[PDB]
Design a protein around this nucleic acid. Sequence first.
RNA 1: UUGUUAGGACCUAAACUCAAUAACGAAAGUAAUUCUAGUCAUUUAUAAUACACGACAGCUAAGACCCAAACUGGGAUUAGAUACCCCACUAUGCUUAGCCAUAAACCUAAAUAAUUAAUUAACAAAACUAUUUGCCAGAGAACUACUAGCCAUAGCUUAAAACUCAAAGGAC
Lengths: 100, 117, 97, 136, 137, 86, 91
Amino acid sequence: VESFASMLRHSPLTQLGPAKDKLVIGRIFHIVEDDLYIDFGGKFHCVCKRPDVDGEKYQRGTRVRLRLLDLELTSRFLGGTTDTTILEADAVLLGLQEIR
Amino acid sequence: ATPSLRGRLARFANPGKPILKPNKPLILANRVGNRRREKGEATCITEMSMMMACWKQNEFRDEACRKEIQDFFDCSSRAQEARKMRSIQESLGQSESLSPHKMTKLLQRFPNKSHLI
Amino acid sequence: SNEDLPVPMENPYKEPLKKCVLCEKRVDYKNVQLLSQFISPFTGCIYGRHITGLCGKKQREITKAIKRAQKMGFMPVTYKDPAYLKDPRVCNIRYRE
Amino acid sequence: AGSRLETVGSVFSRTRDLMRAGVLKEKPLWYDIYKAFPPLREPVFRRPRLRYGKAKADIQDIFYQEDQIRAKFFATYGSGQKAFDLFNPNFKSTCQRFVEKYTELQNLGETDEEKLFVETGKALLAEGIILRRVRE
Amino acid sequence: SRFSLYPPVPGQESSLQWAGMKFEDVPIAHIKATYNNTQIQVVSATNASLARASCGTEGFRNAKKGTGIAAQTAGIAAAAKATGKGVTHIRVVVKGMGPGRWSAIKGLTMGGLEVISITDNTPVPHXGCRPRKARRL
Amino acid sequence: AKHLKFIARTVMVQEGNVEGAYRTLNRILTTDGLTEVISRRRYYEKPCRRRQRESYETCRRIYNMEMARKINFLMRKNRADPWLGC
Amino acid sequence: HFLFYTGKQSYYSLMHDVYGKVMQLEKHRAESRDLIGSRWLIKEELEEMLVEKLSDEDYAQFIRLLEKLLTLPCGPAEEEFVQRFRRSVTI
RNA sequence: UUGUUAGGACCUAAACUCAAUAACGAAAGUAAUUCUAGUCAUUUAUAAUACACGACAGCUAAGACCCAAACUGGGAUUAGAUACCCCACUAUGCUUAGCCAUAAACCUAAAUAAUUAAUUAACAAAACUAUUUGCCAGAGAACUACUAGCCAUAGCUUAAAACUCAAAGGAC
Ligand code: FES
Ligand SMILES: [K+]
Ligand SMILES: [Mg+2]
Ligand SMILES: [Mg+2]
Ligand SMILES: [Mg+2]
Ligand SMILES: [Mg+2]
Ligand SMILES: [Mg+2]
Ligand SMILES: [Mg+2]
Ligand SMILES: [Mg+2]
Ligand SMILES: [Mg+2]
Ligand SMILES: [Mg+2]
Ligand SMILES: [Mg+2]
Ligand SMILES: [Mg+2]
Ligand SMILES: [Mg+2]
């Protein structure tokens, strides 16, 4: 049985390295009006806006392309003892993935 | 970039004399202040002066200043609708930004904690 | 024990530190063209480090050079020389709306 | 009648005490289960405190040896134009193939990092992968 | 191919002329706007007096002498004397930060003078004379 | 006094928008801090009072600027409720 | 009832059903005015159906969830469901 | 008198912006420019009856004087107004020597070396160990009386008792 240490070393997330300005594939699982909730394989989903072009194409289950920025949006503020987190990830929707 | 707060307050770490002496603790509150009311500016002030200017020459006789009197009504008639239309729509929409009440409720969904959980 | 355990080391991906627009350059009082890029075109006032974007060290070098140049008959005090009104803009500021 | 003091002892110790006291006449149903299969740590209250002075945490930064190679690859070529798929458990990215080849050459005995980086680029070029040396 | 807020540079060649006059030649309107009285003087580019006015000379007195409408009247009066003397374009150097700082320039516009530029010469000492003590209220 | 006249604090009127020229002139003097300087030079501020004021303004700027960050940091999470009804 | 410890087992049991209906309509994918001259039941009427007491905030949330159901594509089962909470206005 | 002066003289006084900076100095204090002189190694803590300093105000002699300004005079306000507001003007703030040695001289937190768990009287700027010196022992009487020292003479440091009370005080 593979060890947890081995699993982590060869994990896709460990291979990604820093997540800033990386390209990843996500999946839309929830849509509220023109807001798309996209799972890109991380801890937290991201929330993007439906593009004007090919808006109807972005339906639930649609795999898309993204440019990650943060896996979790967090920041300590003046007088805080802990980082405030919004339980959300940061990414830029680039467009649909070609099925090919 | 927020100013530096290192070596400003009077503390047992700081070797030198303090720079900043805050009246109140420097901890972000979970509310925003109530924005103080803003008032507008006089509308049709120029057109009123023109009307009044003509009267002075013509002994306050409306016969001479018939055209100017109609311009004063025109500006007031436009502004009358403008104040009506803008209060009904723009103020209700609050589209551009949040109000103090709406902002504070969002600041309370992710509140600042100066104490350990 | 385990070959796959992580190895202590310094961060390989650590990002480089940002430098100021005058990092490792010589600020001279006689270079009035460069000094004029950090004053106001209308009043000639020195900009603060939240406008020039300089570090503490280079901000003080520019301040000490503008005053020396202004005091030694090289630079005007109440405005920016009209010659340098066309030079590159390196200060975050907009008088016009 | 109970022990609503959750900062002294634990639910098990306070339940043990209430039975010794004489107030609780019937064992709770969860009691014997805890006695036979207790948790690893006793659930006792501890007030969180800040660290002060030179006290520091004990968390190891996770850096494998491949990161030295991966850091150079991202700085020289950026992220592979092919998009990462983090849903496939066995996904092989353009960078991970670079690191697999760089390791293979290093096993042969090449000792110069410059030699291993330009040779690996040539091998992937033969494979047909499109590596763009984007300084931008 | 755009307008320049910055004034022409003295000692250079420019294409900007007003009424067949260069920038250095256009007469200057000196407005001293204080917190009590707003004075106005118009001079030729050789520093020769052409018009003079102020809220006081118009006839305002005490607290009325320091209102916006009082300076507006003074500017219109200064324009009339200057317009008679042969002045159509003025360079407005407005000293002072009082109530009739803008009103005096607005009166000059109402009086038939064409402002081509606005300078500010409010005294700003660089360290100078100790000001009078703060008033308690 | 020894400098050249009409270069400093001078604006040019564009197509007869004298009010715009005045409004730009004031924006310059306010942005450059001359307005506050002349305002505070009417009377004398005592050295202890000046230091108390600068400490106050710096602490306010620090608070206001940081408060803006939290507002902008949470601006994105203000969206339609995805989990309405639960 | 599995929601006994909520304190409003019947209000939350109803809000559980309507939220599950909404999810299937949203996952699975015409004019919505199938019924006209009707009103949503008042809080007093809802309280009687649930045989429990509600707050004004509890009523307001229930209506918003029911409206969202109407917005979405509705099979005849949903139309019968929302009908239960629509009272024919005796204009 | 006033406004303008790309006119002349003066070099009195004070140092905008930079400074959203936080450096230097034992403290007091110190930020216009230039140059000269210049801070530096005692293991560390610990000192008076000695030595050297010490904001502001004040004193002595001679100068300076733009502006500010106790006092004083005039105007107003008020029942009165020895005030708050307005005007004028002096001691004084400046320089050269000497004196005086006091501040909420307080960052109300002595200095030094640690420690951050075995740890909330309240509030403030988290708790706490060791070392050495100084200081405190209910409030008022009392920054007083007397004594001695001092360039100080309506002064500074040093500093009681009688007598009175059953509280005073701190935080909430
Ligand atoms: S950041 Fe290097 S000198 Fe400014
Ligand atoms: K203090
Ligand atoms: Mg306080
Ligand atoms: Mg004169
Ligand atoms: Mg002169
Ligand atoms: Mg030297
Ligand atoms: Mg009197
Ligand atoms: Mg004198
Ligand atoms: Mg003296
Ligand atoms: Mg003392
Ligand atoms: Mg002090
Ligand atoms: Mg005393
Ligand atoms: Mg005494
Ligand atoms: Mg004595």
